[PDB]
Amino acid sequence: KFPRVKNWELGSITYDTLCAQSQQDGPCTPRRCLGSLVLPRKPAEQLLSQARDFINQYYSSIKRSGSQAHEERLQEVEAEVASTGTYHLRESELVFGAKQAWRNAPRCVGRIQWGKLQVFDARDCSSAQEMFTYICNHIKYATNRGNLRSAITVFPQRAPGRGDFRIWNSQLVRYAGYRQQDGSVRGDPANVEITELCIQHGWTPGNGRFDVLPLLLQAPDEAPELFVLPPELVLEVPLEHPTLEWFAALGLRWYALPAVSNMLLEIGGLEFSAAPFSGWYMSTEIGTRNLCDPHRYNILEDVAVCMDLDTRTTSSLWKDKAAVEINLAVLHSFQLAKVTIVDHHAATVSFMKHLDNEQKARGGCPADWAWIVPPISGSLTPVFHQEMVNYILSPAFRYQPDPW
Amino acid sequence: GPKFPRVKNWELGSITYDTLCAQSQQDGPCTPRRCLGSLVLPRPAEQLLSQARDFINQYYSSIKRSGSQAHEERLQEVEAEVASTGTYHLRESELVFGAKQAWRNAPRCVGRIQWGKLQVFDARDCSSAQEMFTYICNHIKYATNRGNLRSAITVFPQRAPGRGDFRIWNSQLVRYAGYRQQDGSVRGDPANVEITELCIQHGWTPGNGRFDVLPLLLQAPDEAPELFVLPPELVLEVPLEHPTLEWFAALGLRWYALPAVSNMLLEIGGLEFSAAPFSGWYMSTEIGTRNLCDPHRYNILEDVAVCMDLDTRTTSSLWKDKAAVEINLAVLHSFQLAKVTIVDHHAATVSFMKHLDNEQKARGGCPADWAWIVPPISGSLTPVFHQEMVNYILSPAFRYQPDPW
Ligand code: HEM
Numbered sequence: 074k075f076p077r078v079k080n081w082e083l084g085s086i087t088y089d090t091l092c093a094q095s096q097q098d099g100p101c102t103p104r105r106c107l108g109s110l111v112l113p114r115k116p117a118e119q120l121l122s123q124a125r126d127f128i129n130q131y132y133s134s135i136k137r138s139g140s141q142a143h144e145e146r147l148q149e150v151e152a153e154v155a156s157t158g159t160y161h162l163r164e165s166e167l168v169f170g171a172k173q174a175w176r177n178a179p180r181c182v183g184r185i186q187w188g189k190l191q192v193f194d195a196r197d198c199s200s201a202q203e204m205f206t207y208i209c210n211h212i213k214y215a216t217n218r219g220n221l222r223s224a225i226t227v228f229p230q231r232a233p234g235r236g237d238f239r240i241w242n243s244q245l246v247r248y249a250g251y252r253q254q255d256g257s258v259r260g261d262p263a264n265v266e267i268t269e270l271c272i273q274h275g276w277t278p279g280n281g282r283f284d285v286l287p288l289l290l291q292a293p294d295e296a297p298e299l300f301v302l303p304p305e306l307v308l309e310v311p312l313e314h315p316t317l318e319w320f321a322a323l324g325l326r327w328y329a330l331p332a333v334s335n336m337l338l339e340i341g342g343l344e345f346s347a348a349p350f351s352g353w354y355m356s357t358e359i360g361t362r363n364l365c366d367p368h369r370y371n372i373l374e375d376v377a378v379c380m381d382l383d384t385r386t387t388s389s390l391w392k393d394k395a396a397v398e399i400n401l402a403v404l405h406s407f408q409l410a411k412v413t414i415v416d417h418h419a420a421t422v423s424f425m426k427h428l429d430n431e432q433k434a435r436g437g438c439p440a441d442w443a444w445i446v447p448p449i450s451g452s453l454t455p456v457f458h459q460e461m462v463n464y465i466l467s468p469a470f471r472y473q474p475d476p477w
Numbered sequence: 478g479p480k481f482p483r484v485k486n487w488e489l490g491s492i493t494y495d496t497l498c499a500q501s502q503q504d505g506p507c508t509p510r511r512c513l514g515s516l517v518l519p520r521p522a523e524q525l526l527s528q529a530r531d532f533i534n535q536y537y538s539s540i541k542r543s544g545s546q547a548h549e550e551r552l553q554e555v556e557a558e559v560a561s562t563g564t565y566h567l568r569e570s571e572l573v574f575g576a577k578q579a580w581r582n583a584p585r586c587v588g589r590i591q592w593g594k595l596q597v598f599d600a601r602d603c604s605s606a607q608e609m610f611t612y613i614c615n616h617i618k619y620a621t622n623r624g625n626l627r628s629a630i631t632v633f634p635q636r637a638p639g640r641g642d643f644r645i646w647n648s649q650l651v652r653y654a655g656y657r658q659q660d661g662s663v664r665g666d667p668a669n670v671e672i673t674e675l676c677i678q679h680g681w682t683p684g685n686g687r688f689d690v691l692p693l694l695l696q697a698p699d700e701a702p703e704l705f706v707l708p709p710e711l712v713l714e715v716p717l718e719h720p721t722l723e724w725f726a727a728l729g730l731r732w733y734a735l736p737a738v739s740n741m742l743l744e745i746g747g748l749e750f751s752a753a754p755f756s757g758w759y760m761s762t763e764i765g766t767r768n769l770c771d772p773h774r775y776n777i778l779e780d781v782a783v784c785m786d787l788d789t790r791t792t793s794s795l796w797k798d799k800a801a802v803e804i805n806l807a808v809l810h811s812f813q814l815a816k817v818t819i820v821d822h823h824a825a826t827v828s829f830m831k832h833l834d835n836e837q838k839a840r841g842g843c844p845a846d847w848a849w850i851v852p853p854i855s856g857s858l859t860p861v862f863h864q865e866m867v868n869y870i871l872s873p874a875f876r877y878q879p880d881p882w
Pocket residue numbers: 175178180181182183184186190223224225333350351352353354355358415420444470
């Protein structure tokens with residue numbers, strides 16, 4: 074049947090009926106539940122049916138379903154696909170698809186914002202070099218002297234029997250991670266592979282802990298070229314703690330723009346293999362994960378030491394204590410630097426309203442509970458106590474293999 | 478590769494495959510098109526024989542006598558019993574085996590490293606509500622062990638064909654009362670309101686503290702539940718205090734030492750033990766974060782926060798976070814002071830990683846509910862956050878059942 078969804082702090086109950094229109098399978102079956110898995114294990118009128126749907130969405134979107142602006146566009150798509158085994162989106166259909174993709178993304182806690190999205194059409198792109206300029210202008214628009222702005226840039230759709238446009242980096246801004254022969258890593262351990270790929274394509278590596286990587290940009294069926302971001306573009310914030318004055322002296326810093334460049338944007342059967350998008354950070358992304366994750370910069374113990382805590386045992390909650398001070402120093406710094414950012418408390422509160430908006434508009438909202446609940450203070454936020462239904466709506470952002 | 482789920486740990490990069498879920502014979506909440514893993518409660522001699530046979534097989538396999546003559550004789554023995562009396566009965570050691578298995582098979586339990594060490598008390602002879610109370614008193618004494626807590630379960634008679642069930646009406650053996658106020662608010666534990674008013678409807682003389690231990694509502698077959706009050710010295714409590722905040726002690730917060738669930742059904746070989754309370758010991762965050770800081774429980778976060786002189790009028794002061802940490806600290810500190818068994822959420826999840834590693838070798842996987850295994854604070858600061866998990870129902874099982882009223 075149709076799932077009962079309950080908030081356990083409030084006592085309220087909904088019914089997700091939007092899930093009924095899920096056309097692709099998630100990882101689960103009745104026998105096993107694989108909801109905690111980060112990545113998934115894995116003719117022509119399948120395309121044509123995917124594209125019919127998306128068009129129906131778009132015209133229902135702009136109130137005028139079943140007109141003939143509608144049904145003519147239906148015949149365009151059908152005709153185009155019938156003759157070429159593919160078709161093309163009109164720019165405004167693309168702006169719609171891009172907003173629907175964000176709206177539909179079960180893992181995003183920021184979809185209250187989903188309507189306010191700047192879409193740059195960059196399909197008139199024929200080279201790595203053009204790709205670079207597009208990206209450079211994405212970042213300046215999006216960074217916006219620190220008053221950040223949600224933005225996506227969309228490079229040419231994939232094509233049968235032609236390579237893909239790809240951005241090799243996982244994010245537009247990331248820090249180099251140089252493996253030390255001595256087991257260790259200087260910089261961000263999440264970026265070792267790509268760091269070396271850069272080096273491999275002739276980047277002159279630094280030896281810093283927060284060195285900004287260059288971009289490997291790749292036009293179809295050509296070697297990836299390498300581009301170095303004008304240092305002006307990369308807005309960084311130094312971290313410092315509003316009361317702990319030794320904190321600033323930890324040399325910690327984080328870039329301001331969260332822009333993801335390795336996912337696939339799927340609209341109406343069409344796949345866009347380079348379509349980087351960006352927003353602003355939630356504090357816990359920087360302060361809990363990027364800095365305290367054991368397989369990341371992993372600074373819990375350092376801070377703990379300067380906080381003169383009891384590292385000797387876990388039941389002193391030294392880790393917990395350290396973490397809170399880091400998250401505070403990240404909110405402090407960004408606020409003091411006037412760079413946009415949101416705390417996990419503010420974010421999940423707004424997501425709860427989004428849930429309510431969504432429930433009334435579409436009868437539901439696909440959400441991945443494990444990703445929607447922040448990495449600290451789990452039950453201290455309202456989304457913890459909220460049941461969620463998860464499913465794949467299209468348009469959709471997706472994971473795809475790395476181009477090497 | 479393998480036709481089984483591939484499971485990865487993102488901290489260590491390590492990979493496993495769950496082969497044990499192939500023996501999950503009962504379907505859960507999710508389907509290919511919808512995941513329902515966040516839901517707390519998703520909704521004949523024929524059928525008995527199957528479950529029966531399966532369990533006996535598990536058993537003889539656990540004692541490495543699978544396909545032996547004792548094995549095939551047990552199966553005939555059960556078939557015979559089911560054939561005449563519609564039901565069948567477990568041997569002592571079968572029961573013990575099943576009880577430990579049901580614990581072992583429990584996805585939401587982070588304490589399962591210990592699953593092999595479980596005192597099973599057989600109360601299948603128990604024949605009155607009066608006797609239920611005595612067994613339950615006995616359990617609490619043994620399990621509490623003056624603060625050196627010991628895990629245990631007590632098993633009262635199984636559901637019988639056309640005969641009322643043994644039921645303990647209370648959710649736990651120890652629960653603080655919830656009193657609906659003249660205002661609308663609740664004094665004490667809002668969770669326990671319904672049971673609290675039921676105690677009263679059944680004759681309890683209610684107090685009015687924040688921490689009034691409820692009486693037991695104990696129901697023998699086809700009899701109205703009878704009220705039983707627990708002798709206060711049997712119910713060990715811990716006065717919460719903070720190692721450096723001297724004022725914390727003044728808040729008069731206490732919690733009881735023994736988590737003991739009394740309303741779950743225990744199922745083995747298709748046999749239903751409607752009343753089979755079991756107990757372990759607390760993990761720090763259960764008390765400090767859920768029970769004391771949940772908006773819909775004692776809700777003391779803002780109060781602690783105000784005492785801490787925090788900016789409770791901005792989310793970004795992380796005043797909620799600062800106070801949550803110190804409340805958990807106070808819980809840990811206080812139980813350690815009182816010499817009462819308690820495990821912090823760090824050390825607990827670390828033990829569970831070892832259990833996972835053990836279960837991988839022993840069975841080919843471990844059924845696990847990620848959202849219940851990850852602590853309610855400091856989530857990613859524990860190893861289990863970075864551990865993918867597979868959730869499926871194995872039997873023997875601890876199940877939920879409707880409230881008897
Ligand atoms: C405007 C401010 C935004 C905030 C505060 C925000 C917040 C978040 C957070 C906390 C996550 C979890 C990611 C993680 O823990 O690694 C996430 C993921 C995600 N967000 Fe948002 N987001 C924002 C804007 C956007 C925009 C503009 C888009 C797309 C146009 C978007 C689409 C997504 C998608 C597709 C994911 C899944 C990430 C993945 O699986 O790699 N979000 N977001």
